[PDB]
Amino acid sequence: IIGGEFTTIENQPWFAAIYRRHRGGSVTYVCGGSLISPCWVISATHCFIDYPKKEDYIVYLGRSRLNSNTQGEMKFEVENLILHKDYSADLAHHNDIALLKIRSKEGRCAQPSRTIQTIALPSMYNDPQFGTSCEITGFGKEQSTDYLYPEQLKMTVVKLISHRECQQPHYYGSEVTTKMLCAADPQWKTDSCQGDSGGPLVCSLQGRMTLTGIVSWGRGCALKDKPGVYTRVSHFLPWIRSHTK
C-alpha cells in the first residue's frame, strides 16, 4: 500500500495472509486474500499460477504483522487450491480469481473471533457508483522502489473509476474489461502495490461491507493515469458458488 495508514487485523478481520514454503524450509509472503466463509479464502490466480501445488502454502487469519505472530491468530494448510481455468495474462490478467480451502493441522476451519470474521459477497452485477470511496488492505510495498514489505498491515482509500474513463487510451485502453474494476486516488498519491495482490477492495453497499474487488494488476503504483485494477467479484458469483459448494 502506497500512502494510506497502518492498521491491525481488527479493522479488516477477513484479511488472510498467504505464504509459501520453499524447498529448503524458507517461508516467504505471497499475497493477501479474504475469508468469505469459515473454510474458504478468496484471492487472485496470478499469485499461485507458477506454483499451483497446494502443499506449498500456509494461510494465516487474525494476523496483523508480516513476520511475527499476532496474538489469537490461526494457521492453516491449504486443503485445495482452485485457480480459474480461464485465467490469462499479458499484464492485464483476465479472470484473476482463486479459492483456497483452508484446514488447520487439527482438521478445522476458521473460528470467528474479534480478529477473524467473514466478509460478505456482493449481489450479482451490483457494484457501487463510480466515484464511491472504498478501502484496500495489504502487506505490499509502501514505495514502488522499496525492496522490503512493511512489517505492519496497511490500508488506504481509493475511488472507483468508470469503465469509460479506465478504457481511455491514456489510462489502460483495452487492457481493462467489464470483469475488472479500476480504482485510484484523485491525486494519484495512494494505491495498491506489489504484494497487495489477492487482497480485498471493500465498499459499503446498502449499509453492508462488501467484497467488491480483489487486487489484481496495475502499471507501477500510485502513477498518474494508471489506476489499480481489481477483479470485479460481482461478475464471478456462479464460479464462486460452484467451486465452494
Binding site: 505471497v30 499469485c47 499461485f48 507458477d50 502495490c193 497487495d196 494488476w217 503504483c221 489499480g228
Partner: peptide, 12 residues
C-alpha cells in the same frame, strides 16, 4: 516484476 501481477512468479 516489481509491481502487481507478477507476485510469486518464477521469472521474477
Amino acid at each position: 516484476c516489481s509491481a502487481r501481477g507478477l507476485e510469486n512468479h518464477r521469472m521474477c
